[PDB]
């Protein structure tokens, strides 16, 4: 736990501006950007931090699942066609069965996680053979060799706050990427790589303003 | 922030949202069961 | 056939009403393109009222001498899909609401100035009090058993 | 040493008077004037305001019940 | 004890003295002790008769579909023709039950009152524990210990659940639940609540 208070250690998102006082910069990925001041009170602050982390991780997974199969279609062996139209793809089972199974299992898991949030340490999975003392928690970073078997979130590979900063920044970027992909498919009728190459060929004209 | 929460807990806005939700439920039921005169379940 | 009211699964004036309604609807329908979305919705409402007439001709609805449904609330559960079951359902709902409101008020009575929580509801307490509706028949029951539902000679003040 | 009449303090009282808004009502004593020339020496606050906007008035002891 | 929510604290209503405690009251019904007793007795009786009923549903069905026996479905047994007409056995049931259950209720209101068979004075009864009657009910001298009451209540709760399942599945289908199981084993994905709507 390292703090990033005002000064050179605090590169303000808006140069020449004093960041909101209740934005200390402890949470990695902070730059003093909350003009709406939603993080005014601490309970809301931590709640929004958890929401941000979850959104970032899910958005990373979603953008990977969009990107990789489409390029492996374009040039790779197997041809995974339009992902936006894969939502209605036909499988062995009906979409509602898939939906209810997803909801059951994810409700189980996310409910256990919800109780962990409301009551830290009271719902954890970390066995204890004798004489080896286990690690604690920092909710949002469960620890133990279930979700950190590489021993990366604790020390050695990088000071923690730096790696969490990497994570939150990449997650914000991935959120932008997902909303961009979706909005493009709303407007255009291709995948992300197709729009990409179309822009590469004609950067000067092949844009949103092409029509 | 908490001020806007206590403000949102003031009866006008709470009542408006509650009534909107109830009316939406009723109109959706009517959509999924047109003219619904009797109780043809038992 | 209560007092001679035949069900309009068999009466005729019902068929006449249905015929005239669908007829005026169809005559209105032939003033647009056969594919225009308004004409499409018109045909949709046509088939909708048709299947309504059909549904009414499926649930023993005794039917007037002028071609109109007519409820039979005399108590005979033969025609109960009109009053008895919807009646007890609405009674359940009303008891739900009454009990939850009463319990909320009885709870919040114990504060400094309960008016401040009567104008601005304790939405947290409201949320953890509200779903108790499933208890309203039984709970109040025990209350009356234990006499903790009414009062005897405390009238004003509290 | 002369025994002061009226309840001591904080004693919730039940009103016996008929022609007040709080007939059969539960109030709280706030003081009693020890002067034996008074004619209504106790005074009671309530949690329910009456029509005139007032929330306090006077009584004798006969119109009180020292409930608890 | 086993709070069914690894993070929630159990309310003071269900300490753990009574068997099967898990703090499973998210609506605070039995927070009054006498009503807690009432619902204890109600759960006991409902679970016992639900076990009875679910046995009487399942076992006949499989023994008939096995070819060893022949007996109609539990729902198809009403219209069946017996040595006795319906109303006769029904009124006999009514009188016998209005005796037994009213004695049970009198025991509930008064612990240890109606003990003896009021016909003969010996042979009567050893004093009991409410909800767990005495000699003439447990002939095999089973010790009423823990892990017996807990197993009873758990089996009875699951039996209640299974009975409600039987009833609603007969409602939606009208078929034998074991046939539903066979169709299920054929293809659990092609055979579920989804397709039948
Ligand atoms: C309380 C539980 C209970 C359940 C689930 C049933 C089940 C049923 N009984 Mg029933 N019975 C029950 C109590 C009793 N029955 C009977 C004796 C009969 C007879 C003689 C008949 C039924 C019939 C019926 C059916 C009524 C039609 C219907 O469900 O409309 C929705 C239904 C399958 C009828 C039937 O089997 O038709 C299919 C029928 O003829 N039952 C007795 C002894 C008198 C009961 C005592 O509790
Ligand atoms: C002992 C409990 C029990 C068991 C073993 C079953 C078993 C079955 N039910 Mg069923 N059911 C139950 C209770 C149960 N039900 C209850 C309480 C209800 C009322 C809400 C229903 C309502 C119901 C309907 C409406 C239908 C089934 C159907 C079915 C069959 C296909 C499964 C399916 O569609 O999902 C079952 C659907 C449910 C809504 C069941 C929910 C049960 C709850 C969640 C408790 C069960 C949890 C339990 C611990 C997990 C299963 C235990 C098992 C592995 C031993 C299957 C044989 C279908 C069928 O017959 O088609 C083949 C069907 O159409 N059930
Ligand atoms: C839904 C996704 C989501 C959520 C919950 C958050 C949540 C948060 N962000 Mg954030 N952010 C996101 C997406 C998200 N972000 C994306 C996609 C970007 C890239 C444009 C950013 C860029 C960003 C910056 C630059 C900063 C934050 C900050 C914050 C924190 C201040 C409180 C706040 O803004 O209210 C919660 C948000 C809402 C209620 C949305 C309305 C909070 C933990 C500030 C902070 O303290 O850093 C940690 C800050 O300086 N965010
Ligand atoms: C973010 C969540 C997410 C979601 C909802 C989906 C959804 C889907 N993926 Mg998928 N995917 C994702 C992320 C996601 N992907 C990521 C991050 C990757 C790694 C790049 C993949 C790699 C991937 C492959 C390689 C395939 C899918 C396929 C599919 C489809 C059927 C699933 C199947 O049969 O595979 C079952 C596979 C399991 C491992 C189980 C479905 C539309 C399949 C498809 O397009 O249909 C044939 C398929 O072959 N996905
Ligand atoms: C990208 C980056 C740079 C990180 C970085 C980190 N993650 Mg992380 N994570 C990501 C994506 C990323 N994650 C995604 C997409 C998921 C969803 C599958 C997760 C799920 C996740 C868990 C569940 C955990 C981490 C943990 C960690 C830390 C080791 C480090 C801060 C661990 C940690 O810090 O715990 C001590 C940890 O427990 N992350
Ligand atoms: C990571 C952000 C990102 C990137 C790299 C792209 C890239 C692209 N978009 Mg795009 N887009 C984005 C976000 C992004 N978008 C978002 C958030 C939306 C929702 C409003 C859209 C909506 C959108 C539509 C509707 C269309 C494109 C299209 C395109 C392609 C042609 C460029 C163009 O005309 O659009 C320019 C894109 C915008 C004006 C969107 C503005 C939003 C982004 C975030 C601008 C900010 C820049 C970014 C933060 C700085 C770089 C970060 C990083 C890449 C280094 C190009 C590959 C077109 C296409 O399909 O190609 C043929 C097209 O028709 N975009
Ligand atoms: C004194 C007025 C009165 C009351 C209290 C009830 C009350 C009831 N009637 Mg009833 N009924 C009434 C007048 C009344 N009805 C009149 C005027 C008629 C027509 C002559 C009927 C004909 C009637 C029938 C035919 C049946 C009832 C039935 C019932 C019961 C269901 C319910 C308790 C039903 C019943 O007995 O229980 C199923 C039933 O089958 N009622
Ligand atoms: C849950 C609260 C509640 C309960 C249990 C009752 C109960 C009763 N009221 Mg009543 N009442 C209420 C609220 C309530 N009232 C409110 C808010 C008003 C003002 C609009 C009235 C106005 C009123 C009049 C004018 C009369 C009664 C009468 C009666 C009695 C007969 C039933 C009747 O005629 O009601 C008829 C039904 C109504 C009047 C509808 C009012 C019910 C409201 C809409 C429910 C309020 C719920 C709450 C505010 C919402 C918050 C929900 C929760 C999350 C907190 C009965 C004791 C009658 C009586 O004296 O009988 C002897 C009578 O003449 N009430
Ligand atoms: C008629 C059936 C019935 C009754 C009387 C009870 C009664 C009781 N159960 Mg119980 N239980 C039941 C069915 C029943 N249960 C079933 C079917 C299950 C499995 C899903 C359970 C699972 C269960 C657990 C896990 C626990 C209890 C506990 C308790 C006790 C305290 C909770 C309470 O006040 O419940 C009172 C219940 C009612 C008044 C029922 C009201 C009717 C509701 C609305 C029915 C719900 C909808 C219905 C399906 C239609 C109480 C003695 C707790 C306890 O203290 O153990 C000792 C506990 O830990 N039960
Ligand atoms: C499911 C059930 C009750 C379930 C109640 C539950 C879960 C309540 C849960 C909660 O309260 C708690 C715990 C805590 C609260 O904060 C939350 C809620 C959720 C409110 C009772 C079923 C109870 C079911 C019972 C008692 C069934 C008995 C069946 C019998 C006797 C069968 C008889 C037959 O089968 C034979 C014998 C012969 C056949 O031929 C004919 C017939 C007649 C059909």
E117 at the C interface (CB within 8 A)?
A: no
Q: Locate the ligand 8 atom nearest the alpha carbon of residue C129 and give its number.
A: 54
Phi and psi angles of residue C120, each rounded to the nearest 5 degrees, phi first: -120, 100
The two structure tokens encoding residue D38: 């008074």
Residue C94: name the closest of C61, C52, C140, C54 by CA: C140
| Distance of alpha carbon C1 from alpha carbon C62, whole angstroms | 7
Phi and psi angles of residue A106, each rounded to the nearest 5 degrees, phi first: -70, -30
**Cβ–Cβ < 8 Å for B25, B17:** no
Strands (E), A109-209: none
- Please identify which residue in the block is written with the tokens 């990695």: A28
**Long-range contacts, E146-151 (Cβ 8 Å, 24+):** E146/E19, E149/E19, E149/E20, E150/E19, E150/E20
CA A211, distance to chain mean position in Å, is 34
Selected for mutation to probe chain B from C118, C120, C124, C127 (highest B CB count within 10 Å) is C120
C9 DSSP assignment: T
Of the CA atoms within 13 Å of residue C113, those in its CB half-sphere come to 6
| Distance of alpha carbon E28 from alpha carbon C93, whole angstroms | 20
**Cβ–Cβ < 8 Å for A195, A181:** no
Q: Is the residue at A83 inside a domain?
A: yes
User: How far, in Å, are A52, A169, E63, E96, E147 from residue A21 at the CA level?
Assistant: 21, 22, 76, 79, 59
Contact at CB, E6 and A97, closer than 8 angstroms? no
- Please identify which residue in the block is written with the tokens 């608890």: D68
Burial class (CB in 10 A: 0-12, 13-18, 19+), E7: middle
Provide the residue range defining the domain that includes E105: 33-186
User: How far, in Å, are A173, A208, C46, D59 from residue D14 at the CA level?
Assistant: 71, 81, 71, 12
Would you give the end-to-end CA distance of chain B in angstroms?
Answer: 51
Of the CA atoms within 13 Å of residue C60, those in its CB half-sphere come to 14
CA E171, distance to chain mean position in Å, is 21
Strands (E), chain E: none
- Please identify which residue in the block is written with the tokens 């023709």: E81
- Please identify which residue in the block is written with the tokens 């293809």: E187
- Sorted by sequence, the CB contacts under 8 Å of residue A182 that are 6+ apart come out as A84
Element (H, E) at E109: helix E86-109
| Distance of alpha carbon C10 from alpha carbon C8, whole angstroms | 5
E108 DSSP assignment: H
Provide the residue range defining the domain that includes C147: 1-158
**Cβ–Cβ < 8 Å for C44, C26:** no
B40 at the C interface (CB within 8 A)?
A: yes
What's A59-108 look like in SS3?
Answer: HHHHHHHHHHHHHHHHCCCCCCCCCCCCCCCCCCCCHHHHHHHHHHHHHH
Question: Sign (positive/negative) of CA torsion C41, C47, C53, C59?
Answer: negative
C134 DSSP assignment: G
Ligand 4 pocket test: which of A55, A60, A63, A65 has the largest number of ligand atoms within 8 Å of its C-beta? A65
Contact at CB, A37 and B2, closer than 8 angstroms? no
Residue B35: name the closest of C43, C74, C50, C28 by CA: C50
Number of domains within chain A: 1
**Ligand number, closest to the Cα atom of E34:** 9
Q: Is the residue at E16 inside a domain?
A: no
- Sorted by sequence, the CB contacts under 8 Å of residue A98 that are 6+ apart come out as A91
Give yes or no for residue A116 CB within 6 A of ligand 5: no
Beta bridge partners of A127: none
**Cβ–Cβ < 8 Å for E157, E47:** yes
- The alpha carbons of chain C give a radius of gyration, in whole angstroms, of 26
Closest CA–CA distance from residue A141 to any residue of chain B (Å) = 28
- Please identify which residue in the block is written with the tokens 């068929």: C15
Question: Sign (positive/negative) of CA torsion E62, E66, E69, E70?
Answer: positive
**Cβ–Cβ < 8 Å for E152, E47:** yes
| Distance of alpha carbon C72 from alpha carbon E30, whole angstroms | 41
Beta bridge partners of E143: none
Residue D21: name the closest of D61, D68, D55, D66 by CA: D55
Other C-beta atoms closer than 10 Å to the C-beta of A164 total 19
**Cβ–Cβ < 8 Å for C119, B14:** no
CA E88, distance to chain mean position in Å, is 25
Crossing angle of helices E33-65 and E177-186, in 10° steps, is 70
The two structure tokens encoding residue E3: 């709070």
- Nearest-CA residue for ligand 1 atom 16 is E78
CA C35, distance to chain mean position in Å, is 37
Residue D26: name the closest of D62, D58, D60, D66 by CA: D66
- The alpha carbons of chain B give a radius of gyration, in whole angstroms, of 17
CA E135, distance to chain mean position in Å, is 21
**Cβ–Cβ < 8 Å for C60, C10:** no
3-state secondary structure (DSSP) of residue E92: helix
DSSP letter for each residue of E6-59: TTPPPPTT--SSSTT-----TT--S-SHHHHHHHHHHHHHHHHHHHHHHHHHHH
Q: What is the per-residue burial (b if ≥16 Cβ within 10 Å, else e) of E47-84?
A: beebbebbeebbebbeebeeeeeeeebbeeeeeeeeee
**Cβ–Cβ < 8 Å for C133, C139:** no
Other C-beta atoms closer than 10 Å to the C-beta of A94 total 14
3-state secondary structure (DSSP) of residue C45: helix
Stretch 37-96 of chain C: residues touching chain B, C-beta under 8 Å: 48, 51-52, 55-56, 58-59, 61, 69, 80-82, 85-86
**Ligand number, closest to the Cα atom of A76:** 4
- Sorted by sequence, the CB contacts under 8 Å of residue E194 that are 6+ apart come out as A94, A96, A97, A100
B14 DSSP assignment: H
Beta bridge partners of C38: none
Of the CA atoms within 13 Å of residue A190, those in its CB half-sphere come to 11
- Please identify which residue in the block is written with the tokens 């390029």: A71
Phi and psi angles of residue E73, each rounded to the nearest 5 degrees, phi first: -65, 155
Residue A64: name the closest of A194, A164, A165, A192 by CA: A192
Binding-site entries of B for chlorophyll a: 28, 31
CATH value at residue A150: 1.10.3460.10
Contact at CB, C120 and B11, closer than 8 angstroms? yes
CA C85, distance to chain mean position in Å, is 10
Q: What angle do CA E8, E14, E19 make, to 5 degrees?
A: 115
Phi and psi angles of residue A3, each rounded to the nearest 5 degrees, phi first: -95, 150
Burial class (CB in 10 A: 0-12, 13-18, 19+), C62: buried
Number of domains within chain E: 1
Residue A136: name the closest of A126, A147, A150, A149 by CA: A126
Of the CA atoms within 13 Å of residue D58, those in its CB half-sphere come to 7
**Cβ–Cβ < 8 Å for D48, C156:** yes
The two structure tokens encoding residue C143: 């209350």
Experimentally determined by: cryo-EM
Number of domains within chain C: 1
| Distance of alpha carbon A93 from alpha carbon A100, whole angstroms | 12
Q: Is the residue at E121 inside a domain?
A: yes
* E vs D contact (3+ beta-carbon pairs below 8 A): no
Other C-beta atoms closer than 10 Å to the C-beta of A80 total 15
Residue C157: name the closest of E34, E134, A24, D55 by CA: D55
Burial class (CB in 10 A: 0-12, 13-18, 19+), D27: buried
- Please identify which residue in the block is written with the tokens 């990409």: A196
- Chain B residues with CB-CB distance to C86 below 8 A: 39
Q: Which residues of D sit within 8 Å Cβ distance of C? A: 21-27, 46-48
Residue E60: name the closest of E76, E48, E46, E49 by CA: E76
Classify the phi-psi angles of B27: left when phi > 0, otherwise alpha if psi is within -120 to 50, otherwise beta: alpha
**Cβ–Cβ < 8 Å for D42, D32:** yes
DSSP letter for each residue of D1-67: -----S--SS-EEEE--SSSTTTT-EEEEEEE---TT-SS-EEEE-SS--TTS--EEEE-STTEE--
Q: Locate the ligand 10 atom nearest the alpha carbon of residue E52 and give its number.
A: 37
The two structure tokens encoding residue C88: 């007890």
| Distance of alpha carbon D12 from alpha carbon A104, whole angstroms | 57
The two structure tokens encoding residue D30: 């706030």
3-state secondary structure (DSSP) of residue C62: strand
The two structure tokens encoding residue E6: 């690894």
User: How far, in Å, are E47, E157, E188 from residue E162 at the CA level?
Assistant: 11, 9, 19
3-state secondary structure (DSSP) of residue A8: coil
| Distance of alpha carbon A7 from alpha carbon A4, whole angstroms | 9
Residue E40: name the closest of E132, E102, E126 by CA: E132
Residue E53: name the closest of E189, E162, E174 by CA: E162
Q: Given a contact as 3+ CB pairs under 8 Å, which chains touch A? A: B, E
Helix, strand, coil fractions of chain A, as percent rounded to 5:
45, 0, 55
Other C-beta atoms closer than 10 Å to the C-beta of A36 total 7
Of the CA atoms within 13 Å of residue D7, those in its CB half-sphere come to 22
The two structure tokens encoding residue C119: 């104008």
Q: Is E182 annotated as a binding residue?
A: no
What's C66-129 look like in SS3?
Answer: CCCECCCCCCCHHHCCCCHHHHHHHHHHHHHHHHHHHHHHHHHCCCCCCHHHHHECCHHHHHHH
C146 DSSP assignment: H
3-state secondary structure (DSSP) of residue E177: helix
Provide the residue range defining the domain that includes D36: 1-68
Cα-based torsion angle of the residue sequence E87, E88, E90, E95 in order, rounded to the nearest 10 degrees:
130
- Please identify which residue in the block is written with the tokens 């043809």: B40
The two structure tokens encoding residue B33: 């069961």
**Cβ–Cβ < 8 Å for C81, B42:** yes
| C59, C119, C121: residue with CB nearest B40 | C59
- Sorted by sequence, the CB contacts under 8 Å of residue C136 that are 6+ apart come out as C95, C96, C98, C99, C100
The two structure tokens encoding residue E33: 């002790």
**Cβ–Cβ < 8 Å for A182, A163:** no
């Amino acid at each position: 736990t390292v703090c990033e208070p005002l000064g050179p250690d605090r590169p303000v998102w808006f140069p020449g501006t004093a960041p909101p006082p209740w934005l200390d910069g402890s949470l990695p990925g902070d730059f003093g950007f909350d003009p709406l001041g939603f993080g005014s009170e601490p309970e809301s602050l931590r709640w929004f931090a958890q929401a941000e982390l979850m959104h970032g991780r899910w958005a990373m997974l979603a953008v990977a699942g969009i990107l990789i199969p489409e390029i492996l279609q374009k040039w790779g062996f197997m041809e995974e066609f339009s992902w936006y139209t894969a939502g209605e793809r036909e499988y062995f089972a009906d979409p509602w069965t898939l939906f209810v199974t997803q909801m059951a299992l994810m409700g189980w898991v996310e409910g256990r996680r919800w109780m962990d949030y409301l009551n830290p340490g009271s719902v954890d999975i970390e066995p204890r053979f004798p004489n080896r003392k286990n690690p604690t928690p920092d909710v949002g970073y469960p620890g133990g060799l279930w979700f950190d078997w590489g021993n990366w979130g604790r020390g050695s590979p990088e000071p923690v706050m730096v790696l969490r900063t990497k994570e939150i920044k990449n997650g914000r970027l991935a959120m932008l990427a997902f909303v961009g992909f979706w909005f493009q498919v709303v407007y255009t009728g291709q995948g992300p790589l197709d729009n990409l190459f179309a822009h590469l060929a004609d950067p000067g004209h092949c844009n949103i303003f092409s029509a | 922030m908490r001020d806007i929460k206590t403000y949102l807990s003031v009866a006008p806005v709470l009542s408006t949202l509650w009534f909107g939700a109830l009316a939406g439920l009723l109109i959706e039921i009517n959509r999924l069961f047109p003219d619904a005169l009797s109780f043809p379940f038992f | 056939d209560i007092a001679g009211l035949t069900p309009c699964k068999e009466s005729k004036a019902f068929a006449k009403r249905e015929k005239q309604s669908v007829k005026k609807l169809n005559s209105s329908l032939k003033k647009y393109a056969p594919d225009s979305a308004p004409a499409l919705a018109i045909q949709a409402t046509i088939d909708k009222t048709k299947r309504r007439f059909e549904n009414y001709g499926k649930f023993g609805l005794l039917c007037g001498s002028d071609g109109l449904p007519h409820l039979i609330v005399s108590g005979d559960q033969r025609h109960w899909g009109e009053f008895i079951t919807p009646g007890v359902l609405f009674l359940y709902i009303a008891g739900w609401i009454g009990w939850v409101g009463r319990s909320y008020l009885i709870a919040v009575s114990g504060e400094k100035k309960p008016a401040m929580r009567e104008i601005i509801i304790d939405v947290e307490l409201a949320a953890r009090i509200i779903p108790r509706g499933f208890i309203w028949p039984v709970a109040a029951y025990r209350e009356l058993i234990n006499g903790d539902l009414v009062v005897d000679d405390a009238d004003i003040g509290y | 040493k002369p025994p002061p009449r009226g309840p001591k303090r904080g004693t919730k009282v039940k009103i016996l008077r008929r022609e007040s808004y709080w007939y059969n009502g539960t109030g709280s004593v706030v003081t009693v004037d020890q002067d034996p020339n008074t004619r209504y020496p106790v005074v009671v606050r309530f949690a329910k305001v009456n029509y005139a906007g007032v929330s306090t008035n006077n009584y004798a002891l006969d119109e009180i019940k020292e409930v608890a | 004890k086993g709070s069914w929510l690894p993070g929630l604290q159990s309310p003071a209503y269900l300490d753990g003295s009574l068997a099967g405690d898990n703090g499973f009251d998210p609506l605070a019904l039995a927070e009054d002790p006498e009503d807690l007793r009432w619902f204890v007795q109600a759960e006991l009786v409902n679970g016992r008769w639900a076990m009875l009923g679910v046995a009487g549903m399942l076992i006949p069905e499989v023994l008939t579909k096995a070819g060893l026996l022949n007996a109609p479905e539990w729902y198809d047994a009403g219209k069946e023709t017996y040595f006795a007409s319906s109303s006769t056995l029904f009124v006999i049931e009514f009188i016998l039950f209005h005796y037994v259950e009213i004695r049970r209720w009198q025991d509930i209101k008064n612990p240890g009152s109606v003990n003896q068979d009021p016909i003969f004075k010996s042979y009567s009864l050893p004093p009991h524990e409410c909800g767990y009657p005495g000699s003439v009910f447990n002939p095999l001298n089973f010790a009423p210990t823990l892990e017996n009451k807990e197993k009873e209540l758990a089996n009875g709760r699951l039996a209640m659940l299974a009975f409600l399942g039987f009833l609603v599945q007969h409602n939606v289908t009208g078929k034998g639940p074991f046939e539903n199981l066979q169709q299920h084993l054929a293809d659990p994905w092609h055979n579920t609540i989804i397709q039948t709507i």
